[PDB]
């Protein structure tokens, strides 16, 4: 596999969200054998700062689910946002539910209906009011609520009023995420290996969450972490599950493939 896809939290970075010695090592020894790297998150791109600094290779790199993608210069190579009534109504469908917190990525910016290291890039939010908000350059709206199952009648409303034009996957328990249609993962690492000049089945991939389930089926190889959550490994039994990322599994799984 020319092209490794790898997801972020829960997978390549430890349990302490550390990128250790040992998997910067791994990207440089693949890295000097020709093994090209795309690095897939929910987080937003501002919010991968320290991470980007401290791979030591030049990739790609997948934010806010596949909505955007940045080369390794930080040139942002594609931007498909939430279409504009979408949004609008995203903004406001739980506005009066006191469990439920709504987020959005406007662009840059990072909005949330109301309230809820040290080297991190300074990542606030700012609140909005019904209404004053622009429906449009988002990336994504996610809700965020202590109660998973709360979240789960949310996730079936929601695929269920509009269907093909909407992505909706959880990441953690605690965030039901909502992406454009035809925007994930996935498809954003066939779009990546596509300009490195491969294909899907040249990829290999790696992922824990409901966010990933598109990349690991589509990916010529797809590794499900043993830490990953039930409902993907359920999803998706055809897949391999490997170790945990508290075992530096993905370098070592990449180690032994490739060296
Ligand atoms: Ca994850």
């Given at each position: 596999?020319?092209?490794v896809?790898?997801?972020?939290?829960?997978?390549?970075?430890?349990?302490?969200?550390?990128?250790?010695?040992?998997?910067?090592?791994?990207?440089?020894?693949?890295?000097?054998?020709?093994?090209?790297?795309?690095?897939?998150?929910?987080?937003?791109?501002?919010?991968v700062?320290?991470?980007r600094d401290?791979?030591?290779?030049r990739?790609?790199?997948?934010?806010?689910?596949?909505?955007?993608?940045?080369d390794?210069?930080?040139?942002?190579?594609?931007?498909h946002?939430l279409?504009?009534?979408?949004?609008?109504?995203?903004?406001?469908?739980?506005?009066?539910?006191?469990?439920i917190?709504t987020?959005?990525?406007?662009?840059?910016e990072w909005?949330?209906?109301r309230?809820?290291?040290?080297?991190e890039?300074?990542?606030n939010?700012?609140?909005?009011?019904?209404?004053?908000?622009?429906?449009?350059g988002?990336?994504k709206?996610?809700?965020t609520?202590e109660?998973?199952?709360?979240?789960?009648?949310?996730?079936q409303?929601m695929?269920?009023?509009w269907?093909?034009?909407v992505?909706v996957?959880?990441?953690t328990?605690?965030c039901?995420?909502?992406?454009?249609?035809?925007?994930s993962?996935?498809?954003?690492?066939?779009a990546v290996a596509?300009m490195?000049?491969?294909?899907?089945?040249?990829?290999?991939?790696?992922?824990?969450?409901?966010?990933?389930?598109?990349?690991?089926s589509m990916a010529?190889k797809?590794?499900?972490?043993?830490?990953?959550?039930?409902?993907?490994?359920?999803?998706?039994?055809?897949?391999?599950?490997?170790?945990?990322?508290?075992?530096?599994?993905?370098?070592?799984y990449?180690?032994?493939?490739?060296?």
């Amino acid at each position: 596999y020319q092209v490794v896809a790898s997801d972020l939290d829960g997978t390549l970075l430890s349990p302490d969200h550390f990128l250790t010695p040992y998997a910067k090592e791994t990207l440089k020894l693949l890295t000097a054998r020709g093994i090209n790297f795309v690095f897939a998150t929910g987080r937003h791109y501002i919010d991968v700062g320290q991470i980007r600094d401290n791979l030591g290779i030049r990739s790609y790199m997948i934010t806010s689910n596949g909505a955007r993608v940045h080369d390794s210069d930080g040139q942002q190579i594609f931007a498909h946002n939430l279409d504009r009534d979408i949004a609008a109504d995203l903004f406001e469908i739980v506005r009066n539910d006191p469990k439920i917190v709504t987020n959005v990525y406007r662009e840059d910016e990072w909005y949330m209906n109301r309230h809820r290291f040290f080297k991190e890039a300074v990542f606030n939010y700012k609140l909005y009011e019904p209404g004053e908000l622009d429906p449009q350059g988002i990336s994504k709206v996610f809700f965020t609520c202590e109660d998973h199952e709360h979240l789960l009648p949310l996730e079936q409303a929601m695929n269920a009023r509009w269907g093909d034009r909407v992505n909706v996957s959880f990441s953690t328990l605690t965030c039901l995420e909502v992406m454009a249609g035809g925007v994930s993962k996935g498809h954003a690492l066939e779009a990546v290996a596509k300009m490195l000049g491969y294909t899907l089945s040249d990829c290999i991939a790696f992922g824990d969450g409901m966010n990933d389930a598109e990349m690991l089926s589509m990916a010529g190889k797809g590794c499900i972490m043993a830490n990953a959550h039930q409902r993907l490994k359920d999803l998706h039994p055809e897949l391999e599950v490997i170790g945990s990322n508290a075992d530096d599994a993905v370098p070592r799984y990449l180690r032994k493939l490739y060296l």
